[PDB]
Design a protein around this motif. Structure first.
Motif, PDB file in Angstrom:
ATOM      1  N   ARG A 125       0.775  -1.226   0.000  1.00 16.47           N
ATOM      2  CA  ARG A 125       0.000   0.000   0.000  1.00 16.47           C
ATOM      3  C   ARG A 125       0.814   1.288   0.000  1.00 16.47           C
ATOM      4  N   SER A 164      -2.945 -13.825  12.047  1.00 14.71           N
ATOM      5  CA  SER A 164      -3.600 -12.676  11.445  1.00 14.71           C
ATOM      6  C   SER A 164      -2.754 -11.938  10.417  1.00 14.71           C
TER       7      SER A 164
ATOM      8  N   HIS B 146      -8.804 -10.794  11.949  1.00  8.71           N
ATOM      9  CA  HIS B 146      -7.403 -10.518  11.604  1.00  8.71           C
ATOM     10  C   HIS B 146      -7.193  -9.078  11.184  1.00  8.71           C
ATOM     11  N   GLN B 147      -8.262  -8.319  10.918  1.00 10.56           N
ATOM     12  CA  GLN B 147      -8.141  -6.870  10.758  1.00 10.56           C
ATOM     13  C   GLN B 147      -7.923  -6.158  12.085  1.00 10.56           C
ATOM     14  N   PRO B 149      -5.731  -7.595  14.716  1.00 12.40           N
ATOM     15  CA  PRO B 149      -4.911  -8.717  15.107  1.00 12.40           C
ATOM     16  C   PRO B 149      -4.348  -8.561  16.505  1.00 12.40           C
ATOM     17  N   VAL B 150      -4.112  -7.347  16.945  1.00 11.88           N
ATOM     18  CA  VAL B 150      -3.554  -7.102  18.275  1.00 11.88           C
ATOM     19  C   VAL B 150      -4.614  -7.366  19.343  1.00 11.88           C
ATOM     20  N   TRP B 195      -5.771  -2.469  12.619  1.00  6.84           N
ATOM     21  CA  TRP B 195      -4.322  -2.325  12.675  1.00  6.84           C
ATOM     22  C   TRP B 195      -3.788  -1.885  11.327  1.00  6.84           C
ATOM     23  N   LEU B 196      -3.050  -0.796  11.325  1.00 11.94           N
ATOM     24  CA  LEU B 196      -2.504  -0.123  10.166  1.00 11.94           C
ATOM     25  C   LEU B 196      -3.562   0.220   9.135  1.00 11.94           C
ATOM     26  N   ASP B 197      -4.788   0.452   9.594  1.00 10.38           N
ATOM     27  CA  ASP B 197      -5.956   0.634   8.768  1.00 10.38           C
ATOM     28  C   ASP B 197      -6.007  -0.304   7.589  1.00 10.38           C
ATOM     29  N   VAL B 198      -5.778  -1.593   7.794  1.00 12.12           N
ATOM     30  CA  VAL B 198      -5.930  -2.570   6.721  1.00 12.12           C
ATOM     31  C   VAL B 198      -7.392  -2.664   6.312  1.00 12.12           C
ATOM     32  N   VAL B 202     -14.154  -2.156   9.154  1.00 15.02           N
ATOM     33  CA  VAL B 202     -14.284  -3.395   9.911  1.00 15.02           C
ATOM     34  C   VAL B 202     -15.563  -3.464  10.743  1.00 15.02           C
TER      35      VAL B 202
END
Ligand code: NAD
Ligand code: NAD
Lengths: 254, 254
Positions: A125, A164, B146-147, B149-150, B195-198, B202
């Motif tokens: 990205r 993940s 998994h979006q 994940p933390v 996480w990391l705006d994947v 969400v």
């Protein structure tokens, strides 16, 4: 995955399992093998340089409990030098359930923070090339040693986190798999503290069952790297290598 | 387990899932219901007092990110007043994968530290009476979103940690089970950071699938408490209550 002329970063390469994994990796004719570890081991470094002088071995001091910004700073400098890094191996670990916060910070947070830092350089990205992450977790993250519950919980966290990451590969370009050693004869498990001393003899009891050596673990570690399976959950237990299947108890549907 | 005249401590009783669980618990004719939460909710407190004025409802300010010693101080005072505590419910949680450290400190470390603190008063080895611990984890601790994940990895940690506590019950006298809500309509999941705006959408994607209300979750929560199964891993998903079986991928043999 062919390791020849690859650029590898290994966090905590100079510990029991690490060193034995590092001896095998350097036989693979890496271009660059970057060791990040909290403490210098000149002996180990000298050894590894002896094994294959074709490999360029670099050591940077690295504590995984530093903030992401710090990791970013250090990785910038490595990426600047090497240009590309193919593989990141996150190997830092402490076993000591008298150290609750430190266990979690090193085993779980630190792994998450190094990974988040390297995604700055890797994320497709942002135009990055993608990357491979190898997380050293533990079989205790599948099923605890419940006399060290904090240690095991922290490894359960990194098994989950790693799973993940592998699912995020299509977005980030970064593939990920975990390496989960069974009991291995290193100094880590020689003696250690159980949580609230529920079992002061936990090290003696563990080494009363089948273990593996660091070397067999080392060997299988590199095999798992060469198999390069995004999402794999590698069990390295009793001298063997196998991918476990994660139970799907629930699905988010996204 | 009959909740009548029991002394319950509920960490983070006043949040979405908490409050609805608290409404059901106070209907059970507890002697003492001690709410530890970071922030006062007078409205929620007033409500709960209204529901069953036979119950003595107490509120103490509590941040789970404080050091054990701090938790020990607070628990000392509570145990002093009440003499006996039957049940501890650890419910603190944040969903926000832009806050990596905070996620882990609150969801994992904080749970572990409150538990470790209460074992001072409960541990049978120190002549304590033993006790019951209810950990609010999450289905994401079985299988990640998994979006986030933390978040998921922190919950995987507390699932593991709770399983280990339950195995330590013969030593400590403290039994323990996790409560693992599926997606529930609280504010926590209304909107949140990946996480990391994947995946910035969400929340909207999660709430496009079957969810459960807080109330159905609340009801099932109290059922699981009353079942009182040491070691249980309760899934509270889609209005139902079920115990899941943990896969034995590996055994320590001790
Ligand atoms: N030995 C086992 O039975 C075993 C089993 C399963 C998983 N593991 C995991 O394997 C890895 C290594 O275990 P081991 O047997 O070699 O233990 P070890 O004691 O030999 O060393 C682990 C490594 O962690 C590094 N480390 C610790 N804290 C660090 C920090 N703050 N910053 C950077 N590096 C840090 C050390 O330098 C060392 O290189 C860890 O991830 C560990 O928890 C070990
Ligand atoms: N809502 C869901 O879909 C869901 C699903 C599964 C598990 N959970 C878990 O349930 C628990 C609460 O979830 P929720 O939906 O009701 O969330 P919520 O946002 O409504 O509130 C959660 C609770 O955590 C407390 N908390 C946060 N930080 C704290 C701190 N530092 N010290 C003390 N308390 C703190 C809040 O004050 C609140 O009482 C958490 O463990 C959460 O992750 C929620």
């Amino acid at each position: 995955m062919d390791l020849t002329n690859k650029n590898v970063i290994f966090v905590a390469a100079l510990g029991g399992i690490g060193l034995d994994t590092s001896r095998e990796l350097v036989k693979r004719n890496l271009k660059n093998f970057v060791i990040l570890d909290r403490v210098e081991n000149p002996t180990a470094l000298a050894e590894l340089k002896a094994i294959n002088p074709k490999v360029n071995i670099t050591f940077h001091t690295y504590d995984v409990t530093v903030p992401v910004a710090e990791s970013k700073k250090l990785l910038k400098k490595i990426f600047d030098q090497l240009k590309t890094v193919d593989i990141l191996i996150n190997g830092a670990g402490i076993l000591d359930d008298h150290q609750i916060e430190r266990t979690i910070a090193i085993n779980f947070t630190g792994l998450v923070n190094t990974t988040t830092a390297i995604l700055d350089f890797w994320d497709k990205r942002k135009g990055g090339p993608g990357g491979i992450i190898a997380n050293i977790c533990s079989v205790t993250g599948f099923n605890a040693i419940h006399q060290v519950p904090v240690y095991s919980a922290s490894k359960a966290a990194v098994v989950s986190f790693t799973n993940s990451l592998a699912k995020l590969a299509p977005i980030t370009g970064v593939t990920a798999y975990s390496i989960n050693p069974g009991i291995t004869r290193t100094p880590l498990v020689h003696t250690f503290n159980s949580w609230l001393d529920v079992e002061p003899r936990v090290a003696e009891l563990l080494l009363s069952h089948p273990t593996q050596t660091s070397e067999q673990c080392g060997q299988n570690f590199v095999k798992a790297i060469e198999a390069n399976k995004n999402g794999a959950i590698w069990k390295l237990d009793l001298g063997t290598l196998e991918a476990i299947e994660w139970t799907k108890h629930w699905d988010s549907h996204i």
